[PDB]
mmCIF file of C-alpha atoms in Angstrom:
data_model
loop_
_atom_site.group_PDB
_atom_site.id
_atom_site.type_symbol
_atom_site.label_atom_id
_atom_site.label_comp_id
_atom_site.label_asym_id
_atom_site.label_seq_id
_atom_site.Cartn_x
_atom_site.Cartn_y
_atom_site.Cartn_z
ATOM 1 C CA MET A 277 167.928 118.703 94.149
ATOM 2 C CA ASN A 278 171.017 117.849 91.786
ATOM 3 C CA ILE A 279 173.647 119.547 90.097
ATOM 4 C CA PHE A 280 171.634 119.725 86.815
ATOM 5 C CA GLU A 281 168.817 121.255 88.852
ATOM 6 C CA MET A 282 171.068 123.343 90.199
ATOM 7 C CA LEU A 283 172.929 125.045 87.236
ATOM 8 C CA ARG A 284 170.059 125.035 85.619
ATOM 9 C CA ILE A 285 168.797 127.706 87.555
ATOM 10 C CA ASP A 286 172.068 129.581 87.650
ATOM 11 C CA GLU A 287 172.391 129.453 83.347
ATOM 12 C CA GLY A 288 169.054 129.678 82.078
ATOM 13 C CA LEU A 289 168.127 127.580 78.734
ATOM 14 C CA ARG A 290 168.508 129.494 75.338
ATOM 15 C CA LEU A 291 167.986 127.756 72.361
ATOM 16 C CA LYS A 292 169.506 130.485 69.983
ATOM 17 C CA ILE A 293 172.834 131.842 70.389
ATOM 18 C CA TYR A 294 173.599 134.701 73.195
ATOM 19 C CA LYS A 295 175.915 136.467 74.809
ATOM 20 C CA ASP A 296 176.351 135.944 78.199
ATOM 21 C CA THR A 297 177.576 137.814 81.408
ATOM 22 C CA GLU A 298 180.687 138.741 79.895
ATOM 23 C CA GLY A 299 179.711 139.531 76.455
ATOM 24 C CA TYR A 300 180.491 135.926 74.715
ATOM 25 C CA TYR A 301 178.611 133.706 72.437
ATOM 26 C CA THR A 302 177.151 131.173 74.459
ATOM 27 C CA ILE A 303 173.069 128.733 73.589
ATOM 28 C CA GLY A 304 171.613 126.280 75.579
ATOM 29 C CA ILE A 305 172.205 126.007 79.304
ATOM 30 C CA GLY A 306 175.657 127.926 79.826
ATOM 31 C CA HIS A 307 177.538 125.874 76.689
ATOM 32 C CA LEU A 308 180.347 128.721 75.877
ATOM 33 C CA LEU A 309 181.097 128.334 72.226
ATOM 34 C CA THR A 310 183.576 131.345 71.586
ATOM 35 C CA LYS A 311 185.029 134.198 73.180
ATOM 36 C CA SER A 312 185.379 135.253 69.573
ATOM 37 C CA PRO A 313 183.448 138.922 68.944
ATOM 38 C CA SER A 314 182.199 137.442 65.337
ATOM 39 C CA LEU A 315 179.013 135.370 65.094
ATOM 40 C CA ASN A 316 180.429 133.635 62.267
ATOM 41 C CA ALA A 317 182.691 131.972 64.095
ATOM 42 C CA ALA A 318 180.236 131.336 66.596
ATOM 43 C CA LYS A 319 178.325 129.715 64.677
ATOM 44 C CA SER A 320 180.453 127.762 63.097
ATOM 45 C CA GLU A 321 181.480 126.676 66.692
ATOM 46 C CA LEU A 322 177.808 125.731 67.158
ATOM 47 C CA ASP A 323 177.562 123.242 63.775
ATOM 48 C CA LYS A 324 180.741 121.712 64.798
ATOM 49 C CA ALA A 325 179.427 120.910 68.339
ATOM 50 C CA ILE A 326 175.925 119.879 67.630
ATOM 51 C CA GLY A 327 177.328 118.139 64.287
ATOM 52 C CA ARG A 328 175.120 119.864 61.565
ATOM 53 C CA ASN A 329 174.374 123.477 60.248
ATOM 54 C CA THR A 330 172.330 124.967 63.009
ATOM 55 C CA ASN A 331 171.967 128.391 61.820
ATOM 56 C CA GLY A 332 172.826 129.596 65.282
ATOM 57 C CA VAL A 333 169.540 127.715 66.798
ATOM 58 C CA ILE A 334 169.044 124.035 68.727
ATOM 59 C CA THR A 335 166.630 122.116 69.825
ATOM 60 C CA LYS A 336 165.990 121.595 73.749
ATOM 61 C CA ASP A 337 167.162 117.863 73.398
ATOM 62 C CA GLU A 338 170.565 119.391 71.866
ATOM 63 C CA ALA A 339 170.725 121.755 74.486
ATOM 64 C CA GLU A 340 170.547 119.001 77.255
ATOM 65 C CA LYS A 341 172.857 117.058 75.645
ATOM 66 C CA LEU A 342 175.770 119.650 75.895
ATOM 67 C CA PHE A 343 174.673 120.034 79.045
ATOM 68 C CA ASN A 344 175.256 116.398 80.253
ATOM 69 C CA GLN A 345 178.834 116.520 77.887
ATOM 70 C CA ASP A 346 179.844 119.735 80.088
ATOM 71 C CA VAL A 347 178.945 118.410 83.462
ATOM 72 C CA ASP A 348 180.839 115.261 82.431
ATOM 73 C CA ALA A 349 184.278 117.274 81.203
ATOM 74 C CA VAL A 350 183.880 119.306 84.720
ATOM 75 C CA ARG A 351 183.425 116.286 86.443
ATOM 76 C CA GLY A 352 186.598 115.122 84.734
ATOM 77 C CA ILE A 353 188.464 118.922 85.248
ATOM 78 C CA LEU A 354 188.104 118.417 89.244
ATOM 79 C CA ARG A 355 190.509 115.325 88.589
ATOM 80 C CA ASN A 356 192.917 117.240 88.867
ATOM 81 C CA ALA A 357 195.724 117.134 90.832
ATOM 82 C CA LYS A 358 195.476 120.735 92.351
ATOM 83 C CA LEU A 359 191.407 120.280 92.447
ATOM 84 C CA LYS A 360 191.165 116.401 93.271
ATOM 85 C CA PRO A 361 192.226 117.072 96.798
ATOM 86 C CA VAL A 362 189.817 119.249 97.411
ATOM 87 C CA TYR A 363 186.752 117.916 95.941
ATOM 88 C CA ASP A 364 187.569 114.267 96.927
ATOM 89 C CA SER A 365 187.206 116.271 100.849
ATOM 90 C CA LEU A 366 183.975 117.513 99.997
ATOM 91 C CA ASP A 367 180.415 116.369 101.125
ATOM 92 C CA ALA A 368 177.690 115.815 98.266
ATOM 93 C CA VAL A 369 176.526 119.218 98.308
ATOM 94 C CA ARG A 370 179.277 121.114 98.484
ATOM 95 C CA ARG A 371 181.030 119.094 95.630
ATOM 96 C CA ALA A 372 177.877 120.441 93.386
ATOM 97 C CA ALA A 373 178.994 124.321 94.026
ATOM 98 C CA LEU A 374 182.555 123.393 93.765
ATOM 99 C CA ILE A 375 181.206 122.085 90.259
ATOM 100 C CA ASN A 376 179.104 125.100 89.819
ATOM 101 C CA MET A 377 181.960 127.276 90.117
ATOM 102 C CA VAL A 378 184.055 125.607 87.544
ATOM 103 C CA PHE A 379 181.543 125.241 84.886
ATOM 104 C CA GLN A 380 180.792 128.824 85.122
ATOM 105 C CA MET A 381 184.802 130.222 85.466
ATOM 106 C CA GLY A 382 186.571 127.183 83.920
ATOM 107 C CA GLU A 383 189.703 125.564 85.844
ATOM 108 C CA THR A 384 191.897 128.828 84.637
ATOM 109 C CA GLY A 385 189.426 130.975 86.484
ATOM 110 C CA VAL A 386 189.446 128.251 89.581
ATOM 111 C CA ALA A 387 192.615 128.272 89.761
ATOM 112 C CA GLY A 388 193.098 132.160 91.852
ATOM 113 C CA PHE A 389 190.691 130.229 94.010
ATOM 114 C CA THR A 390 193.900 128.874 95.698
ATOM 115 C CA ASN A 391 193.511 130.245 99.434
ATOM 116 C CA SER A 392 189.635 129.873 99.452
ATOM 117 C CA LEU A 393 189.946 126.045 97.937
ATOM 118 C CA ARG A 394 192.913 125.370 100.748
ATOM 119 C CA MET A 395 189.836 126.817 103.312
ATOM 120 C CA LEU A 396 187.084 124.696 101.961
ATOM 121 C CA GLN A 397 189.870 121.621 102.163
ATOM 122 C CA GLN A 398 189.874 122.706 105.948
ATOM 123 C CA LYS A 399 186.371 122.996 106.485
ATOM 124 C CA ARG A 400 186.592 126.484 107.798
ATOM 125 C CA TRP A 401 183.160 127.325 105.890
ATOM 126 C CA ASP A 402 182.515 131.273 107.510
ATOM 127 C CA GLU A 403 185.966 131.773 106.748
ATOM 128 C CA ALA A 404 186.278 130.101 103.308
ATOM 129 C CA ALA A 405 182.673 131.794 102.567
ATOM 130 C CA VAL A 406 184.186 135.786 103.662
ATOM 131 C CA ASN A 407 187.735 135.118 101.566
ATOM 132 C CA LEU A 408 185.096 133.459 98.439
ATOM 133 C CA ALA A 409 183.344 136.511 98.282
ATOM 134 C CA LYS A 410 186.490 139.016 97.598
ATOM 135 C CA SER A 411 186.663 138.288 93.893
ATOM 136 C CA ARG A 412 185.882 139.890 91.096
ATOM 137 C CA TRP A 413 183.210 136.907 90.279
ATOM 138 C CA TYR A 414 181.171 137.945 93.995
ATOM 139 C CA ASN A 415 181.507 141.702 92.025
ATOM 140 C CA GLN A 416 180.777 140.779 89.208
ATOM 141 C CA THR A 417 177.604 138.519 89.490
ATOM 142 C CA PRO A 418 176.819 138.777 92.922
ATOM 143 C CA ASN A 419 173.550 137.163 92.815
ATOM 144 C CA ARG A 420 174.708 133.604 91.336
ATOM 145 C CA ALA A 421 178.215 133.814 93.763
ATOM 146 C CA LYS A 422 175.644 134.171 97.208
ATOM 147 C CA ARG A 423 173.719 131.123 96.107
ATOM 148 C CA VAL A 424 176.991 129.466 95.277
ATOM 149 C CA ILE A 425 178.992 130.730 98.535
ATOM 150 C CA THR A 426 175.931 129.777 100.443
ATOM 151 C CA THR A 427 175.944 126.076 99.718
ATOM 152 C CA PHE A 428 179.367 126.192 100.481
ATOM 153 C CA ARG A 429 179.017 127.914 103.919
ATOM 154 C CA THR A 430 175.574 125.685 104.802
ATOM 155 C CA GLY A 431 176.067 122.632 102.800
ATOM 156 C CA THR A 432 172.530 122.739 102.464
ATOM 157 C CA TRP A 433 170.344 123.320 99.120
ATOM 158 C CA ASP A 434 168.684 126.578 100.951
ATOM 159 C CA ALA A 435 169.811 129.350 98.559
ATOM 160 C CA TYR A 436 168.140 127.206 95.852
ATOM 161 C CA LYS A 437 164.658 126.530 97.136
#
């Protein structure tokens, strides 16, 4: 298992514009197009990202292209000054869980997780897992949150197998 397989499980793959769990236009493998309520705006964001007039539909290769880009960008944000120490302190599996979180909620979302982050940095897994659960994230997307949380607690891929 790896990050790509991991996220593909959590996000799915849709080739036509859809609405995510928050009601935002998305396409492919969890690729957020816009927070705006205009589908027009979303189609335009799509053509721009893709580099062609799509008419809200893409190919599987194009979805995989966006995905690769997105994983690399998130890995980039993890080189932040606030995030870097955490990510660098982690083992390979747990780093995958951190990427997942950021992929799903952005920098801005992962921001209110200071306390949990601190606990992960200290390798207090069970304690972190409890703290991570006290969050809107958990209440809103509980099945995904649990898989992620189990991954940080165990350092294995069990939740995904």
